[PDB]
């Protein structure tokens, strides 16, 4: 499940 937005390298 998605918690937030993902920013930057994974």
């Amino acid at each position, epitope marked *: *499940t*998605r*918690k*937030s*937005i*993902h*920013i*930057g*390298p*994974g």
Partner: antibody
Amino acid sequence: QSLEESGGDLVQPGASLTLTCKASGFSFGNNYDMCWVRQAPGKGLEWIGCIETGSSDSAAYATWAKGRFTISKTSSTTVTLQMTSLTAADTATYFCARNFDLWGPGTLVIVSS
Amino acid sequence: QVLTQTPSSVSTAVGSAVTINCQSSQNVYSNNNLAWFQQKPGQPPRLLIYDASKLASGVPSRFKGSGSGTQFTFTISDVQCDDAATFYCLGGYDCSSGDCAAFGGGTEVVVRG
């Protein structure tokens, strides 16, 4: 690895329009947060929504966009933004981004009669 | 979630240091999901800092971010003519209690040479 948006156009108020974000040098079979961001002429950046291309495949939207716009993964190298009921408030350059890190050059939408 | 960015503009000399602030109406996700961008006219945003203080690969170390929770600052050391641009902060938030993201309104940086 790069992104390119297309489908920007001049449209009448009330219209619908679909933009496409095309991936090059990689594919959406891996896990990324693919998001759309817009910018009205002379104004600031505004988040529209995202689609995860990994497990969960979650779509999420800004409250203002929710229910009026959709974002979906349409092939291993394309993500779309479908817009409905357009008004002058929607006139802007539309960018897509991968994890807010890789960005396209943007595509322009003008809503006017 | 509202991310208030100040000042809206600033003019500063080549060789000075310059600081921008961002204040959030609620804690960002994990207290550090916060990023800073640079945007020049006609171009897409460029990621400079993520996770409040981590430098994106290939970004000069005279760019620095700090802060946590709801209060964040961004500082450019040894300002150069090349830095003249608009800068933005972006917050990532808990999706279950509001919108997933919000941009600050931007700071225009003018550089005196």
